[PDB]
Ligand binder design. Structure first.
Ligand SMILES: CC(=C\C=C\C(C)=C\[C@H](O)[C@@H](O)C[C@H](C)O)/C=C(C)/C=C/C(=O)O[C@H]1CCCC(=O)O[C@@H]([C@@H](C)C/C(C)=C/[C@@H](C)[C@H](O)C[C@@H](C)O)C/C=C(\C)C[C@@H]1C
Lengths: 61, 449, 32
């Protein structure tokens, strides 16, 4: 029934991933560094804002 | 036009940046925008009698970048509501200087829906019973939420008119997810259960356990496999999922295309494996959160009905119904206890993500037909293939690429939920994909330079 | 239609933050 379409999809996916341009180290390191920088920026800004505003919230409330 | 012309030129509007803002200044303005969003996220509302109730919209706090009891109780709700209502009006063709009118109408409709949402939130029972607060306190809370929604809209236009990068929705969602992860990794809050002072932050807890406890092996075990507070296995899983999603997000099928009208414009057309960038995650997360919220409301109001019970049974986590099989398992012990639930959840995640990707490529104009139309418009034929085989290669690549990208992103979300990583699969995937979108903007700007 | 820039938006956000803080302080002081 639906086994043949599923096998067709699986084979097409395998052919695609094989034909794809897998990242190398020189690109993976750059992308990981950029993602780490962005995550650090947003997360640490939020962390420091929360740290600052905890005592402020205690004083005002 | 109509009679709405006078009212669409009353709210503040962000002027064009005139010049072209450099990437450093765009990054600085994005940082300022997210700083304002976070600061307002940490400021509680005025007039709240009690926050001891159960959050009716707890499941829409990640997808809406909201925070209960604060100025960003609604989060990015004004932007989403304005966009949805304007898309509904444009599709049904009632409402289609035109750009200024469209922006004014979207602002007005978003603010009206923001007022309605504030009224709904007040009436949901949070902040205390709306009768003891009084009409004055209810109106004050509504006014505060109105001004907060106006500020959110202003920040969104600040980001979208060229002063900053990306949009308000993605920036705020990613910022909230990253803040949650960094808090769970570095919070100094200490919870005492008789054993002693224990920091909530996993790394700070590790350092404190190593410093204070005389048995270093026991401290290491209780800081790595901790269950009462976030532990180090959660952080390792989060970093691992970050790494795997980063690796799979760089996958791309590079089609070598050449122009035929303007000769010499040889370039590359990359078809990413994640063809729909976190679109399946957005759709699935929004659907699950909304279904959870209406299921909670129906259970609270209509407890006992078979239709309500089959939709989902709540204790604030599902314990049965259609909303229980849509929930990630809390621990691997739950997977061992109920394997049917785990199988159904995995199947739902993979199938929903693949179907959402395959539907979105057609909906958003990413199907091979539209890409072939663009290639004909620019004469961008493939170097190896002929001019009459563009559609064939596009059908070979793009549909399979989108389906497998949805499948892989769903599998990554399932893996992150099963490993118990900080921020869950939805939050991790959304944050990393949004950061990759910003990195793509950065590399595009560098390529332009 | 008022066409403000990014600095006016930041100023408006800070003013709203200050207004909320003053509302909280006024409530705390009228309680005491
Ligand atoms: C992940 C994400 C966005 C991220 C976007 C990204 C990353 C974009 C990038 O730019 C892009 O370029 C990236 C590319 C692709 O790579 C998610 C989104 C948008 C979610 C929207 C959502 O859930 O939007 C609902 C709620 C809206 C707010 C609300 O709440 O609006 C009530 C309100 C008016 C009334 C109300 C409060 C009712 C109660 C009963 C409950 O709320 C019941 C609701 C939940 O049914 C009415 C309810 C409505 C309209 C339902 C809507 C669908």
């Amino acid at each position: 029934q639906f086994v043949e379409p599923s096998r067709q999809f699986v084979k097409d996916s395998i052919r695609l991933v094989k034909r794809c341009t897998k990242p190398d180290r020189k690109e993976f390191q750059k992308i990981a560094m950029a993602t780490a920088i962005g995550f650090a920026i947003m997360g640490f800004i939020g962390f420091f804002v929360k740290l600052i505003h905890i005592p402020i919230n205690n004083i005002i409330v | 036009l109509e009679v709405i012309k006078p009212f669409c030129v009353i709210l503040p509007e962000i002027q064009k940046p005139e010049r072209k803002i450099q990437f450093k200044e765009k990054v600085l303005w994005t940082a300022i925008t997210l700083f304002i969003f976070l600061v307002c996220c940490q400021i509680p509302l005025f007039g709240i009698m009690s926050s001891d109730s159960a959050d009716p919209f707890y499941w829409m706090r990640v997808i809406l970048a909201s925070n209960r009891g604060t100025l960003m109780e609604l989060g990015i709700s004004p932007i989403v509501t304005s966009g949805l209502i304007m898309q509904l009006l444009a599709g049904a063709k009632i409402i289609e200087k035109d750009r200024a009118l469209f922006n004014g109408a979207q602002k007005l409709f978003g603010m009206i829906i923001t007022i309605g949402q504030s009224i709904v939130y007040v009436m949901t029972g949070m902040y205390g019973d709306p009768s003891e607060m009084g009409a004055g306190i209810c109106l004050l809370i509504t006014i505060q939420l109105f001004v907060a929604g106006l500020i959110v809209l202003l920040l969104d236009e600040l980001l979208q008119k060229g002063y900053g990068l990306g949009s308000g929705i993605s920036l705020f969602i990613a910022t909230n997810i990253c803040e949650t992860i960094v808090w769970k990794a570095f919070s100094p809050t200490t919870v005492n259960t008789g054993r002693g002072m224990e920091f909530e932050g996993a790394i700070i807890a590790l350092f404190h356990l190593l410093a204070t406890r005389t048995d270093k092996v026991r401290a290491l075990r209780e800081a790595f496999y901790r269950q009462n507070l976030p532990n180090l296995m959660n952080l390792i899983a989060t970093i691992f999922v970050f790494a795997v999603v980063i690796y799979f997000q760089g996958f791309r099928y590079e089609l070598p295309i050449r122009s035929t009208k303007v000769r010499g414009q040889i370039g590359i057309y990359p078809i990413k494996l994640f063809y729909t960038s976190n679109i399946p995650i957005i759709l699935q997360s929004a659907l699950v959160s909304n279904l959870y919220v209406i299921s909670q409301m129906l259970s609270a109001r209509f407890s006992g009905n078979l239709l309500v019970s089959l939709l989902g049974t709540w204790s604030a986590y599902p314990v049965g119904g259609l909303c229980y099989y849509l929930s990630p398992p809390e621990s691997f012990g739950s997977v061992l206890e109920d394997p049917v639930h785990a199988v159904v959840y995995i199947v739902f995640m993979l199938g929903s993500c693949a179907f959402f990707s395959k539907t979105w490529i057609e909906v958003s104009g990413s199907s091979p037909r539209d890409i072939a139309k663009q290639f004909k418009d620019q004469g961008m034929v493939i170097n190896g293939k002929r001019e009459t085989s563009i559609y064939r290669e596009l059908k070979k690549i793009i549909p399979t690429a989108a389906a497998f990208g949805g499948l892989c992103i769903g599998a990554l979300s399932v893996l992150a939920d099963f490993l118990g990583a900080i921020g869950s699969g939805t939050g991790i995937l959304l944050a990393v994909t949004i950061i990759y979108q910003y990195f793509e903007i950065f590399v595009k700007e560098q390529s332009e330079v | 239609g008022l066409k403000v820039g990014p600095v006016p938006v930041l100023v408006m956000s800070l003013l709203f933050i200050a207004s909320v803080f003053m509302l909280h302080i006024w409530g705390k002081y009228t309680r005491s």
